[PDB]
Design a protein around this motif. Structure first.
Motif, short mmCIF file in Angstrom:
data_model
loop_
_atom_site.label_atom_id
_atom_site.label_comp_id
_atom_site.label_asym_id
_atom_site.label_seq_id
_atom_site.Cartn_x
_atom_site.Cartn_y
_atom_site.Cartn_z
N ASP A 25 1.75 6.72 -6.71
CA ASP A 25 0.94 7.65 -7.17
C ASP A 25 1.21 9.21 -6.97
N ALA A 26 1.70 9.55 -5.70
CA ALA A 26 2.03 10.88 -5.61
C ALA A 26 3.26 11.28 -6.57
N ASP A 27 4.02 10.33 -6.76
CA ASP A 27 5.19 10.66 -7.65
C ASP A 27 4.80 10.94 -8.98
N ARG A 28 3.90 10.21 -9.71
CA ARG A 28 3.59 10.53 -11.13
C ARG A 28 2.69 11.64 -11.22
N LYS A 29 1.84 11.74 -10.05
CA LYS A 29 0.59 12.94 -10.08
C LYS A 29 1.60 14.37 -9.84
N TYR A 30 2.65 14.58 -9.03
CA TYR A 30 3.38 15.50 -9.00
C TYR A 30 4.48 15.74 -10.26
N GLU A 31 4.46 14.76 -11.08
CA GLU A 31 5.27 14.90 -12.41
C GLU A 31 4.49 15.40 -13.31
N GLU A 32 3.27 14.85 -13.50
CA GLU A 32 2.35 15.47 -14.28
C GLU A 32 1.80 17.09 -13.97
N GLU B 63 9.91 6.65 4.61
CA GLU B 63 10.50 7.51 3.64
C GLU B 63 9.32 7.62 2.51
N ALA B 64 8.66 6.56 2.31
CA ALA B 64 7.51 6.83 1.31
C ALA B 64 6.60 7.76 1.93
N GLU C 274 0.84 -1.11 -0.01
CA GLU C 274 0.02 -0.05 0.02
C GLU C 274 0.89 1.36 -0.10
N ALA C 275 1.95 1.30 0.69
CA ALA C 275 2.78 2.40 0.68
C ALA C 275 3.52 2.78 -0.45
N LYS C 276 3.94 1.53 -0.97
CA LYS C 276 4.44 1.73 -2.60
C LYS C 276 3.56 2.10 -3.43
N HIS C 277 2.52 1.78 -3.44
CA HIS C 277 1.21 2.21 -4.40
C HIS C 277 1.03 3.88 -4.06
N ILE C 278 0.92 4.08 -3.02
CA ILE C 278 0.72 5.70 -2.50
C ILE C 278 1.92 6.56 -3.06
N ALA C 279 3.24 6.02 -2.81
CA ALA C 279 4.39 6.58 -2.95
C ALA C 279 4.44 7.04 -4.65
#
Ligand SMILES: Nc1ncnc2c1ncn2[C@@H]1O[C@H](COP(=O)(O)OP(=O)(O)O)[C@@H](O)[C@H]1O
Ligand SMILES: Nc1ncnc2c1ncn2[C@@H]1O[C@H](COP(=O)(O)OP(=O)(O)O)[C@@H](O)[C@H]1O
Ligand SMILES: Nc1ncnc2c1ncn2[C@@H]1O[C@H](COP(=O)(O)OP(=O)(O)O)[C@@H](O)[C@H]1O
Ligand SMILES: [Mg+2]
Ligand SMILES: [Mg+2]
Ligand SMILES: [Mg+2]
Lengths: 57, 371, 57, 371, 371
Positions: free
Chosen positions: A43-50, C36-37, A36-41
Motif C-alpha cells: 500500500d505504501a509502495d504504490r501510494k508513494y509511486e503515484e 523491514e516492511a 498484514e505487513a505485506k499489505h501495508i508495505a
C-alpha cells in the motif's frame, strides 16, 4: 524398565504435543501479521509511486 | 417493474438491475471444457463449466472466449453465458424484465440481428434495447460534449459527441486491446526464460499484466534507467511458487498502445488516432473536444497513462489550446453506470422494442429507425 | 509392545523438535521481513508527507 | 445379489464381498511343489500346495510366485490361485457374483485380455470389471484430488488425480518394490555371516525385513551413530534357534527406495519421482497435489518413511508451500477398501462388462470406455 | 582464412568448414559419466566421455543431454562438447577461424549472451556470429520467400519470410520435437511387454523410431486395417536378440505431431500451427507462402509426412488456392548447408562481431544491430 519407559514416552508426548499446539497457534498468528505487513508495505509502495508521479508531472 | 442492464463486453460480463449504483454481478466471459476423461465414477461431472467456476478449474479445463473482437463467434457459448447470468448470478427470471445491451460501434449487422433474435426467442424478454458502449460512458461522466475513448479487452474506439449530437464520420475503431497486450506479454516474457503456452496460464500472465505493468512517461529515458540501474524490477509469486522477477518488460507491454508496430499493426498509436479524430470533426467544436477528453474501459487503468496521453496530445495539438483528460477512478464500470442511468430515465420508457413490434415487423426492427 | 511405543514416541519427539527448529528460522525470517516492511512503510510516510507539501506549494 | 471384490496384488491375494470393511481372506500368492521323493505309502500327498497352506509345508516345497511385477507369468498357477480363493477361502460359487479385479497401470493389454477370458470362460462369472489401484486407493482415503503413491510388493507407481480427472501423461511407474528390497537384504546380510539361498528362506528374510527394518531420517548421521554406538543392534529368533543380531543393516535395506543406485537401478528415488510427477502436471493444480499427497501399499509401512518423504519433498519443493503427507494406519488394505466402496456404489451397476457384451465383442471389449 | 560452421542442435552436433557440400563432423551431443565402481587398476579410465565415443559405451555410462529444448541447461557439458568438436573431430585450432553458430527463435537472451561470452573467452576466437536456423534453411533451399517449418530434436518452429523480409509477429514456436516422440514411443511400447527405462535404452528406442516409424495418410482407416489384418506387423532385432514385433504403434508415434493431445499438450498440431501462421501474415503474400512451403529438420523425414501435411493444409486452405510442399532429400543437414552458404558470401564478411567490438561493448553487443 519397559513400563517406566512407557510412562516416560507418554508424558513426553503429552508435553511435546502441548508445545505443538502452542507453536501452531503462534505460527498462525505470525502468518496473519505477515500478511498484514505485506499489505501495508505494498500500500505504501504504490501510494508513494503515484504521489511521486504526481510530483514529477 | 425493473430493467436489467447487461454489458457483455469481452472477457468480463457485468450485469445488474437498473438504478443500482454499481453492477451486481461481475465475472469473466469464458467457457471451459474438460480435456481429460475422468477416472472416478459417480461424481457426474458437467460437460461445460461456465463463468467464474471455470476460473477455479483452470488446470483441468480448456478455456474459450465466445467474443474475439466485440463480435460473437460462438453463439452456443454466448447463449450459455447469458443463461448463467440470468439464472445463477442474478437468480431473476427474464420473463418480466426489459434488457439493455451494449456493443461497440461499427459491428456486423448480423451480430446485432442474431442477438436480438436469440433474446426474443430463447429467453422471451418483454422488450430489449441496444446501445453504443461510448454514449453510455459519456452519460456516466456527467457530460454532454467531448470525445470518449473506450479501450476494452476486445476493441478500442474513439467517439466524438458534441451537445448530444454524434458525428458518425469521425468515429474511429482500432482492434488493439487488452487481449493483444496479454499475448505480447506472453511473447516477450520468453526472453527472460519463462514459457507460457497453455490457455490456463494466459490468465496468470493477465494477472501479472494487471498487477505490475505501467505506462512510462518517456520511453528512451526509462529504457536507459532500466538498462543502467535495477530499481524497476519487481517480483511476482506464481500459483506454484518459483517467484519470477520482471524488469524492462514491466513497461514495454503497455507501450504497444502508443507503438502498434511492436505487434506488427500498421495503424497509428492511440494518441495519434485521437488527434486525427479531433480534427476529423468541424472547426468550431475542436476546443471543447480538446478540453473534454474522456477515458473508459479496463485497458485505460494503467498507472500514468493519463499523463503520457496528455503530454502526447499536447505535443500534437496547438500550444494555445487547453488540454484536459478526465480519468475517474471507476473507468472499468463507467459503461454499466451510464447504462443504468439511461435505463432509469422516464423518457426512455418509450424507446423499448416491444415483443409485439418485433413479431409484427421482424428482426430487422433494431436497424430500422426504431433503434 | 512397550519398546515399540517408546520407539514411536522417540521418533515423534525428534520430528517435533525438527519442526520446532523449522519454526525457529521461520520466526527469524518473518520478524526480519516485518521489521523491514515497517521501516519502508514509515519512510514512505515521511516522504509522502514531504511530497504532499511540495505538491501543495 | 452381491458383488465380489478380489485383489490379486503381488505377494498377497486379498478377497472379500463388496460393502465389507475389510477383506475376509488374505493369504500369500504362492504355489509350492514337492522337490523330494516321498517314501510313506498311503498318505497320498497332493502334487501342488497353494496359498497359506504352502507356508506350513515351506520346508519341503519349492515356492514360486505366479507374477513377477504385476504381469502374470504362470497362468496355470494363477488359475489355481483363483480357484483356491473362490472355493477354499470364500466357499462361494462365482456363477452368481460379479467380480471386481484390480490391475496396475501401464501393463500389457494381453494381460487384461487373458484375465477377462479366464474369468468369463473358466469360472463363468456373470459379469466382471477391472480397475486401477490408484483410483481405489484414493477412493478409500476419502479424497478427490492429490497424487497417490502405491508401492506394493511388485511395482511402485505414482498417479496424480485432480477433481476426479486423471493425468495419464504424468503417471509414473518404477519396478522397485518389496521383492527387490528382500533380495537386497539377502545380499547385504551375507557380509555379517548369515547366508540365505533357498526359496524357503526367502520368507524368513521377508519376515525379518517386516519386523526389524526402518527408514532413517538421515543416512550419514545414522551411519556415523551406528559406527560407534551399538544401540541400533537388534536380535531375531530363527525358526530353529541361533538368534541373529543385525546392526546398521536394518535401516540400510529400505534406503534402496530413496537410493536405487544401491541395486544398480538407473532411475531416481521415489521422493524424486513424486516431485517430477507433480511438476509434470499443470501449474494451476500443483498446490493441491502438494497438500494432498497420499501413500498406499504394504511397502510404505516402514516406520519413519513419511517423515523422510516429507523432508525430501520440502527440500525439493519451493519453501512457500505446505507439504502434507497422508499415511493412514491401514495402508496395506487401502486398495481393497476402495474397491469395496466402488463396487457398493449404485451408479456403478451399469458399468459392468456383462457376459453378453463379452460374447458379442470378444475379449477385447475390456479396452472400450469400460476401461 | 576460413570460417567454421557449427550447429549445436539438440542431441546432434554437426560442424564443418564453410564452403563445403556437407558437414564433416556429425555426432550426438551427449556426455557420458561412469556410474559403476571400476575394479581394474592402471586402466587410466576417464571420468567423462563425450560425442560418438559415449555411444560405444552406453552400457556402463549414464548419458546426459546438455540441451533440454534449445536452451543449454549445463554449461560445463556444452563447453566439453565444443572443445571435443574443435580439437578432436575437426582438429583445427579455433584461435584463427571465425565461428558461425545457430539458434532457434524466441531463445532466452541470457543463453545467447553466455554463448558469446564463453566463445570469446575460453576458445578466444577472433570473430563470431549467431544466426536463426530458419533463415539458413531458406538460403539452403535456394528460395527467397516461403514459410519454413524447422522441426528439430528439441524444438519445432514455423517462420515466414517474404522477399527476404521476416515477420517476427508471425513466428510460431512449439516444444514438441523428436525427444517427445521418443518418450511417447517408450510409453506406448509397454503395451506389448517391452520395458525401456535406462537412458541407454533411449538410443535403442530412437533407432527403432528412425528405422520403422512412418506417418499415416489417414488415422482411423490405418487403425482399422491394423486391427483387422496383420500386414503392418514388422520385426526389429535388438542388440542381443528376442526380436520385437511392432504393429499399429509403428505409425501411432508420429501422429503426436498432428495430435499433441496424445501427450497432454494443449497446442494444436503442426498442420494447424502452419495455417495459423499463414493467416497471421498479410493478405497479399499468402499465395506465395502457400505455394512455397519449406520443410527442414531431422524430425521431418517420416515417410509420408509431406503428403499428410499437404492434405491437411488443402483441407484448411481455400479450394481455389494451390498448396505445394518442398521436401528436399537432404532435410536434416539443410541448416548447415545454409550456414555454409551464408558464411561463403563476401558481403557477410562485414557482419562479423570483432573481438575488439565485444571487449569495448561487452556481451550486450550481440543484441544490437549485429543481430
Ligand atoms: N488495472 C489494470 N491494469 C492493467 N490491465 C487492466 C486493469 N484493469 C483492467 N485491465 C484489463 O482490461 C480488460 C477488461 O476489459 P473490459 O473493460 O472488461 O472490456 P469489456 O468491457 O469489453 O469486457 C482485462 O483483460 C484486463 O487485462
Ligand atoms: N510392516 C511392514 N514393514 C515393512 N514392509 C512390509 C510391512 N508389511 C508388509 N510389508 C511388505 O509389503 C509387501 C506386501 O505388499 P502388498 O500390499 O501385498 O502389494 P500388492 O497390493 O501389490 O499385493 C510384502 O512383500 C512386505 O515385504
Ligand atoms: N528417418 C527418421 N525417422 C524418424 N526420426 C528421425 C529420422 N531421421 C532423424 N530423425 C530424428 O531427428 C532427430 C535429429 O534432429 P536434428 O536435425 O539433429 O535436430 P538438431 O539439429 O536440433 O539437433 C533425431 O533425434 C531423430 O529422432
Ligand atoms: Mg467494454
Ligand atoms: Mg497392490
Ligand atoms: Mg536443429
Amino acid at each position: 524398565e519397559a513400563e517406566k519407559a512407557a510412562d516416560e514416552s507418554e508424558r513426553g508426548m503429552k508435553v511435546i504435543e502441548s508445545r505443538a499446539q502452542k507453536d501452531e497457534e503462534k505460527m498462525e498468528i505470525q502468518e496473519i501479521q505477515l500478511k498484514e505487513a505485506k499489505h501495508i508495505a505494498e500500500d505504501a509502495d504504490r501510494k508513494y509511486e503515484e504521489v511521486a508521479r504526481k510530483l514529477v508531472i | 417493474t425493473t430493467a436489467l442492464v447487461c454489458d457483455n463486453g469481452s472477457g468480463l460480463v457485468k450485469a445488474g438491475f437498473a438504478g443500482d449504483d454499481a453492477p451486481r454481478a461481475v465475472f469473466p466471459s469464458i467457457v471451459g471444457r474438460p480435456r481429460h476423461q475422468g477416472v472416478m465414477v459417480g461424481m457426474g461431472q458437467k460437460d461445460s463449466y461456465v463463468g467464474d467456476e471455470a476460473q477455479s478449474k483452470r488446470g483441468i479445463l480448456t478455456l474459450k472466449y465466445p467474443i474475439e473482437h466485440g463480435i460473437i463467434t460462438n453463439w452456443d457459448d454466448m447463449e450459455k453465458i447469458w443463461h448463467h447470468t440470468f439464472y445463477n448470478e442474478l437468480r431473476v427470471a427474464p420473463e418480466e424484465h426489459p434488457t439493455l445491451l451494449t456493443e461497440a460501434p461499427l459491428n456486423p449487422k448480423a451480430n446485432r440481428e442474431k442477438m436480438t433474435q436469440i433474446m426474443f426467442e430463447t429467453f422471451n424478454v418483454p422488450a430489449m434495447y441496444v446501445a453504443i458502449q461510448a454514449v453510455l460512458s459519456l452519460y456516466a461522466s456527467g457530460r454532454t460534449t467531448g470525445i470518449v475513448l473506450d479501450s476494452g479487452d476486445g476493441v478500442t474506439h474513439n467517439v466524438p459527441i458534441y451537445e448530444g449530437y454524434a458525428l458518425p464520420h469521425a468515429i474511429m475503431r482500432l482492434d488493439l486491446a487488452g487481449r493483444d497486450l496479454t499475448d505480447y506479454l506472453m511473447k516477450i516474457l520468453t526472453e527472460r526464460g519463462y514459457s507460457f503456452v497453455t490457455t490456463a496460464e494466459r490468465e496468470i500472465v493477465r494477472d501479472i499484466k494487471e498487477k505490475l505493468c505501467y505506462v512510462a512517461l518517456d520511453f528512451e529515458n526509462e529504457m536507459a534507467t532500466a538498462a543502467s540501474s535495477s530499481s524497476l524490477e519487481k517480483s511476482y509469486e506464481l500459483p506454484d511458487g518459483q517467484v519470477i522477477t520482471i524488469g524492462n518488460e514491466r513497461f514495454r507491454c503497455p507501450e504497444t498502445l502508443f507503438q502498434p508496430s511492436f505487434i506488427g499493426m500498421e495503424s497509428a498509436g492511440i494518441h495519434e488516432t485521437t488527434y486525427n479524430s479531433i480534427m476529423k470533426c468541424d472547426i468550431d467544436i475542436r476546443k471543447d473536444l480538446y478540453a473534454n477528453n474522456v477515458l473508459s474501459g479496463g485497458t485505460t487503468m494503467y498507472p500514468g497513462i493519463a499523463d503520457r496521453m496528455q503530454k502526447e496530445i499536447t505535443a500534437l495539438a496547438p500550444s494555445t489550446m487547453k488540454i484536459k483528460i478526465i480519468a475517474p477512478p471507476e473507468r472499468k464500470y463507467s459503461v454499466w453506470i451510464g447504462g443504468s442511468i439511461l435505463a432509469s430515465l422516464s423518457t426512455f420508457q418509450q424507446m423499448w422494442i416491444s415483443k409485439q413490434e418485433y413479431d409484427e415487423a421482424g428482426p430487422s426492427i433494431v436497424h430500422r429507425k426504431c433503434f
